[PDB]
Amino acid sequence: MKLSPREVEKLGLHNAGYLAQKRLARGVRLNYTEAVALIASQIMEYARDGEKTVAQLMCLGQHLLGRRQVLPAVPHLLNAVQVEATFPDGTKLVTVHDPISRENGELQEALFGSLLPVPSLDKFAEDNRIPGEILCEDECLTLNIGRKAVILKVTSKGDRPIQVGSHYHFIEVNPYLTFDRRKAYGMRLNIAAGTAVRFEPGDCKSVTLVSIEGNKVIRGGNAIADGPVNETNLEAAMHAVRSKGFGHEEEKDASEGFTKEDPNCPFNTFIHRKEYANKYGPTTGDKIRLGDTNLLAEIEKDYALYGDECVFGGGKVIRDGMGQSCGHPPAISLDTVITNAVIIDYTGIIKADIGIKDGLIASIGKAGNPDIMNGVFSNMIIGANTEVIAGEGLIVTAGAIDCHVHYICPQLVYEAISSGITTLVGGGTGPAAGTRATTCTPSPTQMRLMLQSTDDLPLNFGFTGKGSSSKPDELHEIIKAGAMGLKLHEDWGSTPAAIDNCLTIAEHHDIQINIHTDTLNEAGFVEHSIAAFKGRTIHTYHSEGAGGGHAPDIIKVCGIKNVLPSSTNPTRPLTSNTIDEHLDMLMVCHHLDREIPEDLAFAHSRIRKKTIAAEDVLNDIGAISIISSDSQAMGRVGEVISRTWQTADKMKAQTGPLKCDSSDNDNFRIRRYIAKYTINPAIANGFSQYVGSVEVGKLADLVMWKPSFFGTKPEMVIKGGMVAWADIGDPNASIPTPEPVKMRPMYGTLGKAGGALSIAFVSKAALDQRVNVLYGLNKRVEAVSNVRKLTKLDMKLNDALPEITVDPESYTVKADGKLLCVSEATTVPLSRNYFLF
Amino acid sequence: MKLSPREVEKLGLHNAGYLAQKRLARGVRLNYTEAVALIASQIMEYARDGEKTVAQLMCLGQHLLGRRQVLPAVPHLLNAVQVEATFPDGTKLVTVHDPISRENGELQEALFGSLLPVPSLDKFAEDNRIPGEILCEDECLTLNIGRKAVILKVTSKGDRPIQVGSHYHFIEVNPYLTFDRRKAYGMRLNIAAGTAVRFEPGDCKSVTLVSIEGNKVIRGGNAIADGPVNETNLEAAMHAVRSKGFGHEEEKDASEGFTKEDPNCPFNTFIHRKEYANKYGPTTGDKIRLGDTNLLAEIEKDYALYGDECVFGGGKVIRDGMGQSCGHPPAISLDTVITNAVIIDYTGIIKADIGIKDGLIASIGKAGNPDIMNGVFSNMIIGANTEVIAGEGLIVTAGAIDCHVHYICPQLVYEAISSGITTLVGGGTGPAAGTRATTCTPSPTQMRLMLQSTDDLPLNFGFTGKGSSSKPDELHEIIKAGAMGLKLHEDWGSTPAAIDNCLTIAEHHDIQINIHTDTLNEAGFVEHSIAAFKGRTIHTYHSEGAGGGHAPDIIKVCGIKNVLPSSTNPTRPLTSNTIDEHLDMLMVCHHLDREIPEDLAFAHSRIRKKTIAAEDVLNDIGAISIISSDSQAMGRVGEVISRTWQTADKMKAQTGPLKCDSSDNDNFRIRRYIAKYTINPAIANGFSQYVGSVEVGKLADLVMWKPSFFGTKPEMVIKGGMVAWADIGDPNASIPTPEPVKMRPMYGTLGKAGGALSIAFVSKAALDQRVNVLYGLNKRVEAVSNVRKLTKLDMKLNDALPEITVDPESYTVKADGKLLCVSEATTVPLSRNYFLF
Amino acid sequence: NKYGPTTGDKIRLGDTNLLAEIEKDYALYGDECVFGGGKVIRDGMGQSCGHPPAISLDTVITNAVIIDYTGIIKADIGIKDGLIASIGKAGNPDIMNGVFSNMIIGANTEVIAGEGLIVTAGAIDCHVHYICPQLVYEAI
Amino acid sequence: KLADLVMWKPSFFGTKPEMVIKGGMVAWADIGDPNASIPTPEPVKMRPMYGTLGKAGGALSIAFVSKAALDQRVNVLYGLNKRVEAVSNVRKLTKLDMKLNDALPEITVDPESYTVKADGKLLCVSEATTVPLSRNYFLF
Ligand SMILES: [F-]
Ligand SMILES: [F-]
Ligand SMILES: [F-]
Ligand SMILES: [F-]
Ligand code: NI
Ligand code: NI
Ligand code: NI
Ligand code: NI
């Protein structure tokens, strides 16, 4: 066959389309992903037949699926389907624009090539949100306020078109434009940033110009007017204008004035909030729906000065001497700017540019060129040597940190980062039974091997040893070898003697302890494990207890001041299938028999609707501080972020806004919940100064999301300032977006680049020995610290300490004497609209 | 399921077969690739049923597809389909020989297992070339001319068969052959190289022997006659013959003589051109059709001496003391010989062996053993320590060099090398918006990361910085950091001040500048960008301008002496879909709106049938010197080579042979066009002494092609003398060729081998600092040089400088006052016959 | 005495009888690069504030008498990345004539004082028997 | 075995060798004035040779470690250029494995007078007043 890579991939695309076709043919209403697969396959298939032109297929592709053949969100999510195929005249790109345009598709075309029977239209079974929609006040913003302004008539004397962008220095324009150049001096177009004015040959247009600001220095263009704006340079400029034959005509009566907040000022340019949000993403007071959830984030503040947005592209702001600075030392250029980001972080929901430098978040604020813009700090300068990542219309969050990882296989790593996880903490050696059961890398030789093994992967890693020992001796060894924590597990013994010894070791090494308690109550009840803590900081894994712990009341630890409690993700949130699914999973994990009374009694003591219901409420009120995966050992590595948001959405639907919430937005609840997979894991494990939030000085581990896929499938995952993984389409295609679009590894995964972007977290004892040198590690190593004086009060926005009781017979859970109930949800968002399977 | 790798792949093969089956079932005539997929799947499926033997399936597989169910080229391209499957008696290999043998296939068998309705035969819709066919004069060649000859009767006294190859020293044969050993001394069989004479027990055959030549030294075999051929060694040999009991009988009247050019000489052996080409590939005067194009390459010269071809295999020439030399110092053995290559290169279309040593092309000429062959130079010796790559019947070219690469994702790299690209020049950091738009690695920290990232990939890389600056300061930094070029782009500002500053920097650093000019004419028209060049060397990207530049006349730069102009590939050549496809692509890239008059006027100023038509003609006459991809930023990384050949084929069909062409072949046009993706990119960017042609002293970056897939899908890509990527079939199979055959990475991609085979091109400033040491790079680094005194006259075979005018209203293009028109093509070769999608 | 000698002056080589005459001098009298307190190579004076950081010399040897088979001359010697970058008149183009852009002394430039000294290429001994390491030290 | 070999003049045997060869390369040797026309003019001193420069020393030698240490590849952990090998076969040794020094006399020692006997016979030797390999060779 001699298949090239693209042929192999297109076969894959075609198989997804055929799955979508079979589903269509029995009357399924296709989700977004199925609809793309089908339309894109059908375009390839029509191309194979050789009878349809590109222009014909642009039309045919909008006839394939009707509103009634797809889910209600599809016409909203789906703007275009692109694919390339071999026509009789070679590879061509087809874009099918707005493909869901009719009520009913031409199902014979939708099914063309499939040989499937065409279903009758009544087979498709009969209100819905717009995922990621932007809500805006009906209002206009005023651009470039507080500047000198002039209106000039500009005539083209050219025989070819001339188009001039918002931030081009107007005196430097093409000599074949004629206008008052003296009055254009130090001025630029008063138009939306990144837009342009077009002059066809011979046209006259009046334009409004406003003065450049900041230090007011002109650079670049034709070097007509190069230099700081002042009288001497104005004269030199006009001399060059005449000398060089640039068109000039005095316009003695050109109106002059200022821009001001005033809807009647003839110098003003205005832009409606709706269009401002389409161009730049939204600004203060606007709201954003997160994915297809019910949660609304309001922008709390915006660093932008309207009119001076850093937008990159042809005609646009980020160009030599315009938005791109010519007046600063080379060493202070940013490495990268992410322009116009909506930042969602536990510190706030804001709108800002993000400066990246040496792999770090260098600055958050207003970026660009101090020579023509106000408000640009000297750590947010965009220079020749700066890359641009376009954040307009996107949300940017910290990368997620999963601190309950079982290192069972390498493939969960890939699964984790393609979902927005950039830091893994846990243990394991691969799929050994010890690892399948517990987050433990037991042997110093395995700690070495795991660190060498993961050294080129672009994520930060922490490995935990086996803390289940009554003696300190071996624990010192695994910690010196590189352990940044220890994980006590009932499967190796979580008895009071092990607990206490392990904690004493933690006190000495300044590492965090993670515990899965004694389910069996063999050595004690939960109050006896709490007594063995002796007041010392400890992290309780899966605190609700389905994933493990004192039956049935381990969840009591959520009221214990020196406990940092996490949830694992598969109980998040309580839904219709949760209990059946979890009971059987437990029986599978434990090799239990439904026909043995004691086995079934064991399982029922462990899988409990009431504690799991309580766990929804505890998360919501901030009494559980972290969500984590338990990857392949009861939980799901790619669902840390989506389970978090599904819990918030559930609690909002059932209990309404939090106390602390406003009633126009869900900001407080959003900040509380994002903290669960960002900052709190980093605090708990002792590395919050490096990662876990969008804050200056930290690693630029950042994730980009479309609001419509927020919480489910990110656009791109940035690791230490470089793209590590991202959605990208057919590698052979003319552009990056034609099908199949898949999450794929990027340059941050090749060679040893991964190590240059990341940190392996180890203990102090290990770094004092320079384990990184001993082990020939290319990844940076840092020691975890400051984890032995933590309490629940240090968990950001999840510092609640209700007194928790659990009836030992009925399992009823109460917090400060009140029932913790929530019914099961029958559906969750961030699922059916997005997943192919 | 416990799927092993082969099971996963066979599922893939089966899915391709089922695609082919659905297509068959609606009446599609299958292309070569679909037909292989279907036949191979059906063989597996019949094997699964367990009722058919291997021998039955060898027969059944020739009944599946008729001539009417496949495209006209399929019976020519398809010689055998092989696959292995699990029969009731375990894995077996089935080869279906010559599968298209009937008019009409047994479509119920073709569809067996599919549950698809069997289409009636009238569903398949009704002159064609043989892709890669060899055209030969009807003539015989004479072997081994100018040698002493003898005819000896040889009788087997053995009870088992004895077969003796063309270049075995005849006195050393099995003792159980009886003949005149005295007259066999220093002689070998006068038969086609690599063939053999078989002696069944008791048989007598007369054979013609000719003397060995070169230094005439016998080595190996039975050590009967070891040593230089002379009287003393003859006597020693006959003594050993008698002593050792090797069969000998004097044949007093054996005819003796010489070989000579003379059709009547009874000592001569002759071979028809057709068979000589089947065994060795073609020789002087023969022609080869390139793929399924209309282009014919004639072999201009051949280094072979007929009869002494280096052919490797059982019985064959390359064996101890025969074609494989025992008389030379170990250090002068070749590392590898590619035997019997048709070389297509801008320097000529020739037939030669290629010697490889230390990763370099060591020699091009006649290889083998100077002890028995004439004409073997001491740099083309095949020794014990030499590997063989078989080039007979194949074409060998330099690896392609794409010098407009946007480093948008790693996957385009794989796409590039699997198509025959071994060198990438461009810029980017991954899928950042800056990179998606422009070939720029802006930051020194990204230059470091990109070099580390690509350090183990087996291709040569050059990275370009952002040259769009009016100040030199930051440009010095990105160049010192490793930039081997700078890419000025209108999206960062391509104004005269940036242009001039960037060029002044180039003058100092001896790096090439690549430019995408000011489309908008914002700062000037094309004549104003040309004035800003001030006569200095510059490379204009996508010179025709659809991919970007002064609207609408950027293509004028093709007449500018100090301009090195390239095309990008998606406008190559003008076909029926080109304009519709490109207009919409531009609207997608620029986020433009069909409903806004200025937007559509912008697009129509940019996407122009007349300039694109002109661009076909300019390429053809050598006024555009390079073709390049623009990978994922308007162009296609895997189509650099095929778009080149489709342009040549188009121009030949429309305008006939070039002036400079003979009328029996297309050599001149072939040499002109291959130069576009080989030597000229290397000259333009300053590294032509390392790569860019099949010439002694350069890196052995070489690609092997079947003539029938020339220009589309290569056999194997050799990187610095080692196979980097190659077609290979089922990894579990008994041989390398059973389905699925896919282009796959080879040993040159594992460990750090990739770096040992390649070069990262950097600036002089960067190498003076030893950036390779600073950055811990394993790949070799060399500095680019000699790019600041280049003009169009240095572009090999593409040195035309017509004066170009462009009507600013109608867009009509003229070269020296003559219209440049060509109509659109409705089809192109190198597409439909080859691609699955 | 201050700068070493200039065109037409002669120098006796060691205690031999051989006299080297300076054949030419790149200096413009008055603008010699001399480093020390009160001296020429100081911020914004002989030491340039107007050029890109990457084009500062690594080191300048100021006022060298060069003896070489190519000629006996008087010049500053610019060093950059371990290479002889330029030979001529060094300093600051913002206050001096004749300073080429490859002989700029910047903040990031070291000074070696050549005034009154002769500068030659290092010698190359091409008949060395590598009998012990100590002859290496003796040689350099 | 490793070519760790020492060269001696018979007249200085046992006192001052000519040259010490380490893994086949001269490591240290008598050599005279490094500037001299030949290798032997005064002062002749024992001096380090090429085997002591750069990392050559490691290419000529072995660091002996335990089996446990080599099983962990301590040489890699510690970035050692010297070869490492594990010692072995030392737990079944007796005096009988000491080459030419395998005597096992029964030894008694009077605890008061300290008289030593081997198989019941007095072990006496008077003190020597002089020794060879001293006064003829040493400067101090
Ligand atoms: F678990
Ligand atoms: F767990
Ligand atoms: F482009
Ligand atoms: F481009
Ligand atoms: Ni657990
Ligand atoms: Ni777990
Ligand atoms: Ni371009
Ligand atoms: Ni491009």
How far, in Å, is the centroid of ligand 4 from the Cα of B131?
33
For B142, the token pair is 């004479």
* C51 annotated as a binding-site residue: no
Strands, E, within A490-602: which ranges? Answer: 512-516, 538-540, 563-568
Mapped onto helix, strand or coil, the DSSP state of residue B338 is: strand
Using CB atoms within 10 A of its CB, is residue A663 exposed (0-12), middle (13-18) or buried (19+)? exposed
| Residues B672, B644: Cα–Cα separation, whole Å | 10
Task: Report the length, in residues, of chain D.
Answer: 140
Please report which ligand is nearest the Cα atom of B516.
Answer: 7
How many Å apart are CA A705 and CA A714, to the nearest integer? 5
**Cα–Cα dist B551/B543, whole Å:** 12
Residues of chain C in contact with residue A331, where contact means CB-CB under 8 angstroms, are 53
Please state the length of chain A. 837
Catalytic residue numbers of B, as ranges: 590
Tell me how far apart the alpha carbons of residues A660 and B116 are, in angstroms, rounded to a whole number. Answer: 62
Buried/exposed A561-575: b ≥16 CB within 10 Å, e otherwise: ebbbbbbbbbbbbbb
Q: Calculate the CA D103 to chain-centre distance.
A: 23
d(CA B316, CA B601): 68
Are C134 and D47 within 8 A, CB to CB?
A: yes
Query: What gap in Å lies between CA A713 and CA A265, rounded to an integer?
Result: 45
B157 annotated to bind ligand? no
B49 in helix, strand or coil? helix
Find the angle CA(A482)-CA(A486)-CA(A491) to the nearest 5 degrees. Answer: 130
What are the start-end ranges of the H helices in B131-230? 181-184
Q: Are A373 and A305 in contact (CB under 8 A)?
A: yes
Cis peptide preceding D43, ω within 30 of 0: yes
DSSP string, B501-561: HHHHHHHHHT-EEEEE--TT-SS--HHHHHHHHTT--EEESSTTSTTS-STTTGGGGGG-T
β-strand pairing of B485-489 with B360-365: unpaired
Helices A667-674 and A640-655, interaxial angle, to 10°? 150
Ligand 3 centroid, distance to B437 Cα (angstroms)? 7
Between the CA of B544 and the centroid of ligand 4 the distance, in Å, is 11
Flag if D72 and A773 touch (Cβ within 8 Å): no
Tokens of B164: 């003796």
Q: Do the Cβ atoms of A314 and B520 come within 8 Å?
A: yes
Residue in this structure with the two tokens 């007598």, named with its chain if needed:
B204
B545 sits in the region (left: phi over 0; alpha: psi -120 to 50; else beta) called left
Using CA atoms, how far residue A545 sits from A90, A514, A820, B289, in Å, is: 60, 14, 16, 73
**Cα A12–chain centre separation:** 27
Q: Which residue has the tokens 């552009």?
A: A735
Sign of CA dihedral B33, B34, B35, B41: positive
CATH number of A4-124: 3.30.280.10
Q: What residues form DSSP beta bridges with B207?
A: B152
What Å distances lie between residue B464 and A323, A754, B487, B627, CA to CA? 22, 22, 6, 18
Minimum-distance CB partner of C55 among B476, B768, B769: B476
CB contact under 8 A, B473 and C52: yes
User: What span, in angstroms and rounded, lies between the C-alpha atoms of B423 and B401?
Assistant: 5
Calpha distance B422→B48 (Å, rounded): 42
Closest C-alpha to B19, from A1, C107, A381: A1
**CA distance linking residue A673 with residue A670, whole number of Å:** 5
Nearest CA in chain B to C50: B473
Q: State whether B525 and A8 contact (CB < 8 Å).
A: no
Q: Say if CB B614 and CB B544 are below 8 A apart.
A: yes
Q: Which stretches of A101-249 are assigned E, i.e. beta strand? A: 134-135, 140-142, 148-156, 162-165, 177-178, 187-189, 196-199, 204-211, 217-218, 227-228
Rounded to whole angstroms, how far apart are CA atoms A223 and A203?
26
Virtual torsion, Cα A228, A229, A231, A234, nearest 10 deg? 100
CB atoms within 10 A of CB D52: 16
Technique behind this structure? X-ray
> Do residues A480 and A765 touch, judged by C-beta distance below 8 A?
yes
N-to-C CA span, chain B? 30
* Ligand 2: centre distance to CA A598 (Å): 22
SS3 call for A512: strand
Query: How many CB atoms lie under 10 A from the CB of residue B729?
Result: 22
Burial class (CB in 10 A: 0-12, 13-18, 19+), D93: exposed
Q: What CA–CA distances, in Å, run from A606 to A491, A592, A611? A: 15, 13, 10
Residue of B301, B311, B299 whose CA lies nearest to B368:
B311
Read off φ and ψ for residue B17, nearest 5 degrees: -65, -40
Between the alpha carbon of residue A297 and those of residues A219, A342, A654, A831, B369, the distances in Å are 40, 10, 19, 20, 79
Burial zone of B375 (CB within 10 Å; 0-12 exposed, 13-18 middle, 19+ buried): middle
Alpha-carbon gap, residue A45 to A83, rounded angstroms: 11
> Which of 1.20.210.10, 3.40.50.300, 2.30.40.10, 3.40.50.720 would CATH assign to domain A133-143+269-398+698-750?
2.30.40.10
- Cβ partners under 8 Å of residue B750, min gap 6: none
**Chain C neighbours, 3+ Cβ pairs < 8 A:** A, B, D
Binding-site residues of A for substrate, in ranges, read 489
How far is A511 from D100, CA to CA, in rounded Å?
A: 59
Gaps in chain C (C to N distance exceeding 2.5 A) after: none
**Does B442 sit behind a cis peptide bond, omega within 30 degrees of 0 on the bond before it?**
no
The alpha carbon torsion through B750, B753, B758, B759 (nearest 10 deg) reads 110
Please give, rounded to a whole number of angstroms, the shortest distance from the CA of C136 to a CA of chain D.
Answer: 9
Could you give the angle at the alpha carbon of B770 between the alpha carbons of B766 and B773, nearest 5°? 130
Alpha-carbon gap: C54 to the closest alpha carbon of chain B (Å): 6
**Distance (Å) from CA B729 to ligand 2 centroid:** 43
Buried b (16+ CB within 10 A) or exposed e, A190-216: bbbbbbbbbbeeeeeeebbbbbbbbee
Per DSSP, C121 falls in state P
Q: Do A775 and D77 touch (CB under 8 A)?
A: yes
Using an 8 Å Cβ cutoff, are A202 and A222 in contact? Answer: no
**Continuous H helices in B675-714:** 679-685
Q: Which residues of C touch B480 (CB under 8 A)?
A: 54
Chain B residues near residue A753 by CB distance under 8 angstroms: 449, 452-453
Residues of chain A that touch chain C, judged by Cβ-Cβ distance less than 8 Å: 329-331
Tokens of C89: 């008149």
Radius of gyration of chain C (CA): 17
Residue B337 near residue B380 (C-beta atoms within 8 A) = yes
Under DSSP, is residue B458 helix (H, G, I), strand (E, B) or coil? coil
Which residues are near ligand 8, the ion (C-beta closer than 5 Å)? B 630, 633
CA geometry: angle D21, D26, D28, nearest 5 deg: 90
Interchain pair C52, B768: CB under 8 A: no
| Contact residues, chain C to chain B, C-beta under 8 Å | 52-55, 81-83
Candidates 3.50.50.60, 3.30.1360.10, 3.40.50.300, 3.20.20.140; CATH matching B399-686+751-825: 3.20.20.140
| Residues in chain B, total | 837
Q: In whole angstroms, what is the distance from residue A542 CA to residue A615 CA?
A: 10
The structure tokens listed for D37 are: 């026309």
- Which chains lie within 8 Å of chain A at 3 or more CB pairs, if any? B, C, D
3-state SS assignment for residue A535: coil
Going by C-beta distance under 8 Å and a sequence separation of 6 or more, which residues neighbour residue D10? none
Give which of B2, B94, B78, B114 is closest to B40, Cα–Cα. Answer: B94
Residue of B nearest to C55 (CA): B476
Distance from CA of A770 to the nearest CA of D (A): 11
Residue closest to B415 by CA, chosen among A412, A744, A49: A744
- CA nearest neighbour of B692 among B510, B429, B423, B477: B423
**The one-letter amino acid at B39:** I
DSSP string, A594-655: TTSHHHHHHHHHHS-HHHHHHHHHHHHHTSS-EEE--BTTTB-GGGHHHHHHHHHHHHHHHH
DSSP sequence for D11-46: GGTTT--SEEEETTEEEEEEE--TTSSSS-SSPPEE
Q: Do chains D and A touch (3 or more CB pairs under 8 A)?
A: yes
Please name the chains neighbouring D, where neighbouring means 3+ C-beta pairs under 8 angstroms. Answer: A, C
CATH architecture of C1-121: Roll (2.30)
What is the CATH number assigned to the segment(s) B147-259?
Answer: 2.10.150.10
A187-189 vs A204-211, strand pairing mode: antiparallel
Establish how many alpha carbons lie within 13 A of residue B584's alpha carbon, considering only the half-sphere containing its beta carbon: 21
- For residue A371, give the 3-state DSSP assignment: coil
Domain segments of chain A as ranges:
4-124, 133-143+269-398+698-750, 147-259, 399-686+751-825
How many pairs of residues across B and C have Cβ atoms under 8 Å apart? 17
Helix, coil or strand: residue A765 = helix
Residue A749: how many other CB atoms lie within 10 Å:
22
Q: What's phi and psi for A317, nearest 5 deg?
A: -80, -35
Return the closest-CA partner of residue C6 out of C103, C76, C69, C84. C76
Find, among B612, B627, B636, the residue nearest to B672 by Cα.
B627
Active site residues of A: 590
Distance from Cα B436 to the centre of ligand 4, integer Å: 9
Which helix or strand (DSSP H or E) is residue B716 part of?
Answer: strand B716-719
Q: Which two tokens stand for residue D122?
A: 């007095």
Query: Could you tell me which of B257, B226, B256, B261 has the C-alpha nearest to residue B241?
Result: B226
What are phi and psi for residue B512, nearest 5 degrees?
-90, 150
Structure token pair of residue A36 = 């793309």
Q: How many residues does chain C have?
A: 140
- C-alpha distance from A591 to closest chain B C-alpha (Å): 21
Q: What is the DSSP string of B234-298?
A: HHHHHHHHHHTT--B---TT--EEE--S-TT-TT--EEEHHHHHHHH---TT-EEE-TTSS-EEE
C92 min Cα distance to partner chain B (Å): 17
Nearest beta carbon to residue C83 from set B476, B480, B768: B768
Interface contact C132-D29, CB threshold 8 A: yes
CB contact under 8 A, A329 and C52: no
Residues 6+ apart with CB under 8 A from B405: B412, B416, B424, B425, B426, B427, B428, B439, B628, B629, B631, B637
**CA-closest candidate to residue B190, choices B246, B247, B148:** B148
How does DSSP assign B567-594, residue by residue? EESTTSS-BTTHHHHHHHHHHHHTT--T
Q: Are B532 and B500 in contact (CB under 8 A)?
A: yes
